[PDB]
Amino acid sequence: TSAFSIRYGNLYYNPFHALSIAFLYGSAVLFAMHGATILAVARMGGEREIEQITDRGTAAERSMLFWRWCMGFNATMESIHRWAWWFAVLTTFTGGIGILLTGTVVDNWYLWGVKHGLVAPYPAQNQLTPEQQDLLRGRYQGTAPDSFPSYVV
């Protein structure tokens, strides 16, 4: 997992990886919110969600109003499970696309990030002379040596 990110030039700049994280975090946000919400009305039967969906009680109403008063909008007892479903599903769906794009369409995600303007500028930590630019070019990694050389001479 680490070497894959190293090989393809830092997976943080893969936008589908970034999305997959947004849904992964959102799944923890939603289940924290929803778990806490249903336990906060469980003494009024809020955990009997199928009844609250088919025959709305005060436990469903209080759950809707808490979030409406908190953040200005709310789900229903049924539709919060759709938000839950999609956030979980979109975690692995966007993840899969990001992997399929990697090494097929983009080989260096940080440079793709530079191209599309994702990369914040920092002051240069070092500057190379033209002579160093040729000296410090490496070589791509090849095969291991298949012999044990003697240096007897």
């Binding site: 009024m44 039967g45 025959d55 009680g57 005060t58």
Partner: protein
């Protein structure tokens, strides 16, 4: 005017103020879903989901738990409100849904949702009484009734739970 509440003032987004007793009228945290269907909830095979335990001999107390029947119920004002006569159980997901309380110093028996009871020492030891922190022993007399004693409707569930829910705001208030 029967209207349960009036605006605190004419500005947008002002609170409402209850006219009568908010616990009885059902205002604020004492309110219930008034349009809720007035029918019993049903199991998959169509029997009544919530019934007194004496009506289904399948159910029994787990061995080494206390049976709460016959214990006194201690209300928010430390008065003895009554004693547990019966348990009501959920037959779809086996648990105790309500205690039924024979009222002390009164004729009537009332339901008490177990979410509002707690054991002394949270059940670990003692277990010689029940605590109802949310309402006074006087207010136990006004807990809503079920139309029958063998079944409870979804509306009656909402009404009863809403009564104990409101207590934490209105039990110790002159707003009655």
């Amino acid at each position: 005017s029967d209207v349960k509440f009036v605006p605190a003032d004419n500005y947008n987004g002002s609170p409402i103020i209850p006219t009568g007793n908010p616990m009885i009228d059902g205002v604020g945290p004492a309110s219930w879903a008034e349009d809720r269907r007035d029918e019993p909830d049903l199991t998959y095979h169509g029997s009544h989901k919530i019934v007194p335990m004496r009506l289904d001999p399948t159910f029994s107390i787990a061995k080494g738990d206390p049976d709460p029947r016959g214990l006194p119920v201690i209300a928010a004002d430390k008065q003895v409100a009554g004693t547990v006569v019966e348990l009501w159980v959920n037959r779809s997901e086996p648990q105790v849904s309500y205690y039924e309380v024979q009222l002390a110093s009164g004729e009537r028996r009332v339901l008490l949702p177990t979410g509002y009871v707690q054991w002394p020492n949270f059940g670990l030891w003692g277990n010689d009484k029940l605590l109802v922190k949310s309402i006074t022993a006087a207010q136990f007399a006004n807990v809503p009734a079920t139309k029958r004693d063998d079944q409870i409707t979804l509306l009656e569930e909402d009404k009863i739970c809403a009564y104990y829910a409101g207590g934490h705001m209105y039990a110790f208030a002159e707003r009655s």
